[PDB]
């Protein structure tokens, strides 16, 4: 209220001003008379871009190369999402580096199309921000100029590269050129050295000679002084790979076009037949390839595009699956890694290791990125730029900020309190900040566990590795507060506090006495300035990220009955709105109607799959009170 | 070019409890429906009756869904070789399910499920128990709403390892509270569709038999979760190493309408 | 004198899978030496860990077995020695 607050009281004059106008809504706020009013937020401002210190590169839709975008990434929180199940087990030692560049390899381009499914990548990686990138050439917190493999999301701006799996770019490579090394000579090595045993002298034929892999194979053949065939697709590539090699000459070059080089390579062998296949081709390509192995001949089958009847082979162990066995021993990253990490490492030093040519496509253009190495119109490299590198070799990296949409991460050193989060919202709410970050959670009901429903959720959180607590206790006296937070500070810092208690009683307003009108007001007007007064208290209002108080659209539209809860959810969120007054962070959603956890005023309730869709927007959001509800159909006459 | 079986979903045909199975609104005949429909086929070419017919499903490729119509008819087309076993559920031109069904006299199913008579889920607190409110809260979060008829799981244990399923005499609507086990052994937030079923082992001669006609309470058989074999186990039924595909929730609604209470 | 009961398992049925899999802890067994056939290769490829060998030495091989010796699918190995 402005200097002059109004002085509305009986026989004012103020007030006779409000008598004539007659309005059923007078709000003094700001200075100004006016009243409260839900103003649509457009559907383009749900994937607004803003700056972003961490980001990475994900899809809004699964399937779809033209929806890549870059969300905010959770190593703002010195972590990474995905800590849950067999990610436990391995601890590995990880060295945090500020990723300059990233290689764009056709592993990210068969995940991102909807050629393949997340869940056939190794199974540490199902709780992971995103699954796309591997290689990348960046800096690690000492200032040195590094490259190497990590598990995904390597096309990022920050990454956790395991040290085991980081090499050092030399003083000639700028870093631009290590990006494109890393994993097409692992890849070499795996397919030549370490799955097809390569000898000195034996034959290879290697299909797409002209990929970043195949460029690699011939490259890692050559130094082994091997017969190398190669299928070009037309006479561009087979003249880049004369070039690059000098050694080749034409009659190491067939064409990918028809299936004629089987009768070429088993003339040219004298029947004898090649040593190792590296299949990339499938079909009538793969079956001429393993007619023309050796007796002792290896067939190293790293296509992505596997027919049905392969896939069932994987499955029953008839065949090994060698196309995301890179992937695999990054997870594990044990004998077998290391056996490659080596072989990679003599191999730059021997020169075997060199640089390929490459395409640098800037943050932006990652979707154009994605299409170029997809069509496979040219060979080459395609390079995301995250960073410019410095003119220097041992320089920090300066901070910087990138656009990208929003995505809500919960710390996972801090404790996240839940009061009410042993119900229906509160439970399901409580497996997404699981899966965002959340790996500490205290959930306080009157109760406790009291059903099997809750029994099965809370350990599944326990299995997955998250340190839960279950308290059966109200909010509702300092003394139940003060217990509820020597909790959460015992499991860590307070990062976030959740108020999902609800409590209804619905009757008509003049056949509720003031016991039955109170009843909703306690888990919306007293536990909400106990668990306010405790987060503007010392710890937690300096760990705290997230106050979330949930409320309804009976503060916005009103309901017939619930005239108790109204009062409640609208001092609710006035409570909230002191908060951002004082700079504190709050949310507040203001819910009608939600389905999984029927048309009641006119507004289809939602899928709960969709409001956590809308509630990670909410959170992550400038405004207070957030009003989501589903409309039937866009209102028409009478 | 085999048994072409018409699927009436009208008001009082007896194959309406097929609308009640809907994955995100749109309804779908059951991934374990065209298996039923090649072990009908299989035993008509025999000129056995089907419940007399012991099968065993090997390699079920679901290659699409089968959209089911209120008020429509949907005919589809199983040809089954006759000496090989493979099969094809194939709705016009398009293929729905492949994979190779072989019938036998000898005892096909692996695990000894058939022989369990009474639940182990007895005098348990109702606080280590799923009940069927319970069971199906879950699926629905996931997507899957499944209506009266084929909610089958009638109890189960926190761990969802033992279970008790109703048998009705609907064998589609059984097979399916069967992979239902699988489904509740694998927690998560999102929708798998099932694309290859190792193995489905259906033995109707340990099976009870269809109940009496116009009965109100069905009998609930004992079911078991195998999670070192991955074997879903419940009377003659035995569904063994299902995969599953990420399906993209779509929403049933419009987009929900955002606004800034200000 | 090395081998006690709990080494042993049974040629009738395919049993030996789940107490392979319990003894083993998941892990698998690294080789396997397999005679028998049908849902006893499969049963034991089954078995086999993430760098396990399979060594099928058995004589009467199915027809698909034979046509994916001769593709160069899988090495036929019941006849190396010779
Ligand atoms: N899901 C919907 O349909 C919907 C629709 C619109 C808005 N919302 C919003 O979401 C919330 C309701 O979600 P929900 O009911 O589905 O699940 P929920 O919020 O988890 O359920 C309410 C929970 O409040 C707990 N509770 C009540 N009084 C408490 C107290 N004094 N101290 C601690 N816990 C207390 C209860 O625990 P006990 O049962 O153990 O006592 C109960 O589980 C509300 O904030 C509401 O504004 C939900």
Redesign the pocket.
């Known amino acids: 209220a402005g200097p002059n607050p109004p002085k509305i009281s009986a026989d004012s004059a103020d007030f006779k001003e409000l008598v004539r106008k007659d309005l059923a809504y007078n709000v003094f706020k700001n200075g100004k008379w006016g009243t409260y009013r839900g103003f649509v937020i457009s559907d383009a401002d749900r994937q607004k871009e803003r700056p972003s210190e961490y980001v990475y590169a994900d899809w809004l839709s699964a399937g779809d190369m033209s929806s890549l975008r870059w969300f905010d990434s959770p190593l703002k929180t010195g972590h990474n999402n995905g800590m849950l199940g067999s990610k436990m087990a391995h601890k590995l030692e990880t060295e945090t580096c500020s990723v300059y560049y990233a290689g764009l390899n056709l592993r990210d381009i068969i995940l991102a199309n909807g050629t393949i499914q997340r869940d056939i990548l190794p199974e540490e990686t199902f709780f992971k921000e995103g699954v796309l990138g591997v290689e990348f050439s960046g800096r690690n917190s000492s200032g040195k100029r590094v490259m190497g493999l990590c598990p995904p999301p390597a096309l990022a701006t920050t990454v956790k590269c395991p040290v085991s799996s980081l090499w050092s770019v030399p003083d000639q490579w700028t870093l631009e050129e290590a990006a494109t090394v890393p994993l097409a000579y692992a890849t070499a090595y795996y397919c030549l050295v370490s799955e097809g045993g390569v000898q000195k002298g034996a034959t290879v034929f290697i299909h797409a000679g002209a990929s970043v892999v195949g460029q690699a194979s011939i490259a890692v053949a050559l130094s082994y002084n091997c017969e190398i065939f190669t299928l070009t697709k037309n006479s561009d590539e087979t003249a880049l790979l004369k070039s690059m090699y000098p050694q080749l000459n034409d009659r190491n070059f067939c064409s990918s076009e028809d299936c004629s080089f089987e009768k070429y390579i088993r003339k040219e062998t004298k029947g004898s037949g090649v040593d190792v296949v590296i299949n990339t081709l499938r079909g009538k390509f793969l079956k001429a390839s393993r007619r023309l192995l050796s007796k002792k001949g290896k067939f190293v089958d790293i296509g992505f595009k596997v027919d049905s009847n392969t896939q069932i082979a994987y499955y029953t162990r008839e065949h090994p699956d060698l196309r995301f066995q890179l992937d695999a021993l990054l997870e594990s990253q044990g004998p077998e890694w290391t056996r490659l990490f080596d072989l990679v490492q003599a191999g730059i030093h021997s020169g075997v290791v060199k640089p390929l040519k490459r395409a640098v496509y800037s943050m932006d253009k990652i979707v154009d990125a994605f299409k170029t190495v997809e069509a496979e119109r040219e060979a080459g490299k395609i390079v995301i730029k995250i960073r410019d590198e410095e003119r220097q070799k041992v320089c920090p990296t300066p901070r910087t900020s990138f656009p990208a949409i929003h995505r809500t991460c919960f710390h996972p050193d801090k404790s996240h309190i839940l009061?009410?989060?042993?119900?229906?919202?509160?439970?399901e709410?409580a497996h997404w900040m699981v899966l965002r970050g959340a790996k500490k959670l205290i959930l306080?009901?009157?109760?406790?566990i009291?059903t099997g429903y809750?029994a099965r959720k809370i350990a599944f959180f326990k299995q997955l590795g998250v340190e839960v607590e279950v308290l059966?206790?109200?909010?509702?006296t300092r003394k139940?507060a003060d217990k509820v937070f020597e909790h959460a500070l015992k499991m860590g810092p307070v990062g976030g506090i959740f108020?999902?208690?609800?409590?209804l009683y619905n009757d008509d307003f003049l056949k509720m006495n003031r016991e039955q009108f109170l009843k909703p007001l306690?888990?919306?007007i007293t536990?909400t300035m106990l668990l306010d007064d405790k987060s503007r208290e010392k710890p937690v209002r300096d760990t705290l990220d997230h106050f979330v108080?949930?409320?309804?659209?009976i503060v916005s539209g009103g309901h017939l009955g619930q005239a108790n809860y109204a009062f409640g959810?609208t001092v609710l969120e006035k409570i909230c709105e002191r908060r951002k007054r004082d700079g504190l962070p709050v949310t507040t959603?203001?819910?009608?109607?939600?389905?999984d956890?029927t048309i009641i005023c006119r507004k289809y309730?939602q899928r709960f799959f969709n409001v956590l869709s809308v509630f990670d927007f909410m959170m992550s959001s400038d405004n207070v009170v957030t009003i989501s509800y589903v409309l039937v159909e866009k209102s028409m006459g009478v | 070019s085999d048994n072409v079986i018409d699927i009436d979903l009208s008001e009082d045909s007896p194959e309406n409890y097929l609308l009640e199975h809907a994955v995100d609104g749109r309804m779908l005949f059951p991934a374990t429906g065209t298996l039923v429909l090649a072990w009908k086929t299989l035993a008509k070419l025999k000129g056995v009756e089907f419940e007399q017919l012991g099968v065993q499903m090997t390699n079920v490729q679901i290659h699409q869904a089968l959209f089911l119509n209120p008020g429509g008819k949907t005919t589809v087309s199983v040809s089954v070789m006759p000496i090989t076993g493979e099969f094809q559920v194939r709705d016009g031109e398009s293929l729905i399910s492949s994979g190779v069904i072989t019938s036998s006299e000898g005892r096909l199913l692996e695990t000894d499920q058939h022989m369990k008579k009474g639940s182990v889920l007895d005098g348990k607190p109702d606080k280590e128990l799923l009940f069927t409110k319970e069971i199906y809260r879950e699926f629905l979060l996931r997507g899957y709403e499944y209506g009266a008829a084929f909610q089958g799981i009638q109890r189960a244990s926190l761990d969802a390892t033992d279970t008790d399923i109703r048998w009705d005499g609907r064998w589609i609507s059984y097979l399916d509270t069967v992979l239902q086990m699988y489904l509740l052994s694998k927690p998560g937030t999102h929708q798998a569709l099932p694309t290859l079923l190792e193995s489905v082992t259906i033995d109707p001669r340990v099976h009870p038999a269809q109940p009496p006609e116009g009965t109100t309470e069905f009998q609930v058989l004992p079911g078991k979760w195998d999670p070192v074999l991955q074997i879903a186990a419940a009377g003659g039924v035995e569904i063994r190493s299902c995969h599953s595909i990420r399906a993209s929730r779509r929403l049933n609604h419009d987009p929900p309408i955002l606004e800034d209470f200000a």
């Open positions: 009061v009410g989060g042993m119900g229906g919202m509160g439970l709410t306080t009901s009157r109760y406790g009291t809750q059966a206790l109200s909010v509702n139940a108020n999902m208690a609800m409590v306690e888990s919306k536990m108080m949930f409320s309804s659209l959810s959603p203001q819910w009608a109607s939600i389905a956890v309730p």
